[PDB]
Amino acid sequence: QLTEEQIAEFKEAFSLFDKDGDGTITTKELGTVMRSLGQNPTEAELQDMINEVDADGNGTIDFPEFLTMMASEEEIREAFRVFDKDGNGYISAAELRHVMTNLGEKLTDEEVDEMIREADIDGDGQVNYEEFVQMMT
């Protein structure tokens, strides 16, 4: 049972996927998101991704089902490489900004800095792989 703050936070995340704002994430919307992250899932894999979390079997992710879902090493490495575009071992504010922009979310530099700060543990102002793992685990 999450907090009001956290729900609002996840609502913000959910909105990155729901491109038409109709309160439902479709396979087409998930596909758009995934391609904006450098991936190319097939129609079937997109259905599968939706199926794992779909409570009412209606084809799409609504907001409750999105939250439930948010309940391996190679998977985390592969995801880190999406953000760490120059492969230097650190996700910079600029790299995070780029990814968010391509997702259709134009953040101010302060908002980009706060997102990094939340994940940064050593306080060098970037996210390394170990900090990234911790964020997820």
């Binding site: 936070e9 991704m49 998977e75 995801a79 990814v99 968010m100 706060e114 997102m115 997820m136």
Partner: peptide, 20 residues
């Protein structure tokens, strides 16, 4: 704030990689 967003993206990536 957007650590949920940063997490959501990462999780969704992890999901996609799973079914390779």
């Amino acid at each position: 704030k957007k650590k949920a967003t940063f997490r959501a993206i990462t999780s969704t990536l992890a999901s996609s990689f799973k079914r390779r």
